[PDB]
Design a protein around this ligand. Sequence first.
Ligand SMILES: CC(=O)N[C@@H]1[C@@H](O)[C@H](O[C@@H]2O[C@H](CO)[C@H](O)[C@H](O[C@]3(C(=O)O)C[C@H](O)[C@@H](NC(C)=O)[C@H]([C@H](O)[C@H](O)CO)O3)[C@H]2O)[C@@H](CO)O[C@H]1O
Ligand SMILES: [Cl-]
Length: 147
Amino acid sequence: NLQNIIYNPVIPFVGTIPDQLDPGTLIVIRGHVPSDADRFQVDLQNGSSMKPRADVAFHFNPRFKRAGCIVCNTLINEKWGREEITYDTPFKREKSFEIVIMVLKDKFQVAVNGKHTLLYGHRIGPEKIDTLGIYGKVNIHSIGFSF
Ligand SMILES: CC(=O)N[C@@H]1[C@@H](O)[C@H](O[C@@H]2O[C@H](CO)[C@H](O)[C@H](O[C@]3(C(=O)O)C[C@H](O)[C@@H](NC(C)=O)[C@H]([C@H](O)[C@H](O)CO)O3)[C@H]2O)[C@@H](CO)O[C@H]1O
Ligand SMILES: [Cl-]
């Protein structure tokens, strides 16, 4: 079932993932976007090194300026790849949310508040993911895993 690794963590949060993200694994993140929020990110990482900066297999980046959007990308050897921008974003300032990330064989599937939001094909073997980090202006109520 779901095994939360932490509640109301101080942001930025960087934690180690208890088990390998094998296809079928779910990542559940419940939080809230503060009214003065410009953006925030959830990064599935390979290690928690800050320098050199640890690779980010999956960069889930909601942005709030203008109409808003969600930028997804991958950071390999401290270099960002091709961005995959999703314009149909459900995130809003002053609103709560539950993010469910499904780890499939060839990609991540993300749904927010029960509604499908986006897909992102693996650019790095998901098996190299052992750390989860949450940065930016966002309040997190919980982070859990379903292996
Ligand atoms: C072409 C275009 O649309 N403009 C891009 C612009 O999107 C891009 O912004 C960066 O986008 C990546 C994802 O592709 C990340 O979202 C970057 O966010 C972070 C990061 O994690 O790297 C957030 C982090 O907090 C920032 N660190 C600091 C010091 O505050 C870093 C940092 O500012 C940048 O890495 C410096 O380059 O960004 C987000 O900045 C930019 C930069 O790649 O390039 C335009 O062309
Ligand atoms: Cl797949």
